Amino acid sequence: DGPEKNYEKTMAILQIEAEKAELRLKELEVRRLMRARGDGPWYQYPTIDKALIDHSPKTTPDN
């Protein structure tokens, strides 16, 4: 084929691979920050559910 076909295919491939590399670095930074802070949807280790607490009159008045 023409020399321009390989040129444009190479440009598309380079764009895709550069986007992949940037996304990989972004993902690594995001994962590190989420693990360090725990303020995102990832690394949300479970805690005690507050629906188990019994909010009813107990025996002793001081609860």
């Binding site: 020399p3 040129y7 190479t10 440009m11 380079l14 764009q15 691979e17 550069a18 940037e22």
Partner: protein, 169 residues
Amino acid sequence: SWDKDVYPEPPRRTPAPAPQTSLPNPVTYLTKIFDLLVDRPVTLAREFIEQQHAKNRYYYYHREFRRVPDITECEEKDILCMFEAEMQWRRDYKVDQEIVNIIQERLKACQQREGESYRQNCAKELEQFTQVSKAFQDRYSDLGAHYSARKCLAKQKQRMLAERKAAKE
């Protein structure tokens, strides 16, 4: 066929035949025999083949690439611009190699043609080759087997820094 400006040839100064002896020069007879037994059939064959070529006359073109922004006008991670600039730089590298090749062809032709007076009569060709060689060595040298446009840019920046340091001293 080739542009004589690109490949300069000095005007041909051929001495006239001025024989003094009456002996038959065998060279002339041999040349006539050659021109009768080889040149004539070869010329006839070339005439036939050129007629056949002229019967079917088609063309081929020299592809021209437009100028593209260099690596200097290229963002840090702009892969598309970097690719374009790198391809243009590689094309320019090939063109400069061929320029050096043309200059070397000129030098070799001058050296052979001038005979025993080549040293004095090819000083201009030697000077041209020296200029082109120094320019090429400044631009494309010590880059390595993994050369790139970014590496020439770095070498040029280093050279310009050295020039500034020399100028400020």
